[PDB]
Amino acid sequence: YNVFPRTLKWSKMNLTYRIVNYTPDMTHSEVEKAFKKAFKVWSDVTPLNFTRLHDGIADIMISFGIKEHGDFYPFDGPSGLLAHAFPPGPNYGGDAHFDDDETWTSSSKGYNLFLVAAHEFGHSLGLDHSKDPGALMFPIYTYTGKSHFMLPDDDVQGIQSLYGPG
Ligand SMILES: N=C(N)NCc1ccccc1CCCCCCCCCC(=O)N[C@H](CCCCN)C(=O)NO
Ligand SMILES: [Ca+2]
Ligand SMILES: [Ca+2]
Ligand SMILES: [Ca+2]
Ligand SMILES: [Zn+2]
Ligand SMILES: [Zn+2]
Ligand SMILES: [Zn+2]
Ligand SMILES: [Zn+2]
Numbered sequence: 001y002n003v004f005p006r007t008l009k010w011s012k013m014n015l016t017y018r019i020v021n022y023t024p025d026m027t028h029s030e031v032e033k034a035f036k037k038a039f040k041v042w043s044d045v046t047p048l049n050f051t052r053l054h055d056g057i058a059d060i061m062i063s064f065g066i067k068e069h070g071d072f073y074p075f076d077g078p079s080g081l082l083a084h085a086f087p088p089g090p091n092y093g094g095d096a097h098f099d100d101d102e103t104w105t106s107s108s109k110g111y112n113l114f115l116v117a118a119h120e121f122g123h124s125l126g127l128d129h130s131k132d133p134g135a136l137m138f139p140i141y142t143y144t145g146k147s148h149f150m151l152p153d154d155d156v157q158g159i160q161s162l163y164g165p166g
Helices: 030-041 114-122 154-165
Strands: 012-017 049-050 060-065 083-085 096-099
Touching: 012 030, 030 049, 030 114, 049 083, 060 114, 096 114
Parallel strands: 012 049, 012 060, 060 096
Antiparallel strands: 083 096
16 A cells, blocks of 8 residues: 555544536436545444535545646546545545546446545545555456445555554
8 A cells, every 4th residue: 555745644533525517417316425425434433423514615625627727737628537536634635536427337337436535535545546456446447336335454454554543
C-alpha cells in the first residue's frame, strides 16, 4: 500500500458526507446505496464512522460532473479518467468526483459505481495508489460480482496503519 506525502489523514474518527447531485444512469436509491456500501468496506476494519448529511458542508462532498466541473482537474469524456478524489483536509479535502460521461450502473455493465467509489473513498481517507495488482487501491478498473465484497489484505493494512483497527 501507499500513503500520501506527509501521511495526510483525518484528525477524527467520525466523518460526514453529502451527495451533492446524482447521475441519471441509475436510480437515486441505487446511488445512495452504492456510496453507503463503499464507505462500509472502510469502516468495517477501522474505528472510522460515516454519516450522511442532507444539507450543509460535510467532510466529504460527493458529486458527478463532465469535463470542467469546478476544479483544476477536468474530466476527459467517455473512458480514460473515471473519477478522482482529494486526500484528507479542509475544503476539497476528501471530496470525490465522478465522471458522468461514463455509464454508471450497479451491475457488471458500464462502470460499477460501488467499486469505483470504494476506491475513491480510499483516497479521501488518505490512501494513494497501491502497486499490488490484488489491492482495491490499484490504478486499474476491474469488475467483481462477488457477494459481500471484502477489502483486500493490502488495503486493510494501509488503512489501519492510519486509523488503527476497528
Ligand atoms: N487490480 C485491480 N483492478 N484492483 C482494483 C479493484 C479491486 C477490486 C474491485 C474493483 C477494483 C477497481 C477499482 C477502481 C479502479 C480505478 C482505476 C483508475 C481509472 C482511471 C482514473 O480515474 N484514474 C485517476 C487518476 C488521477 C489521479 C491524479 N490526481 C484515479 O486515481 N482514480 O482513482
Ligand atoms: Ca472519462
Ligand atoms: Ca471536503
Ligand atoms: Ca453517466
Ligand atoms: Zn434520497
Ligand atoms: Zn432530500
Ligand atoms: Zn473534480
Ligand atoms: Zn485512484
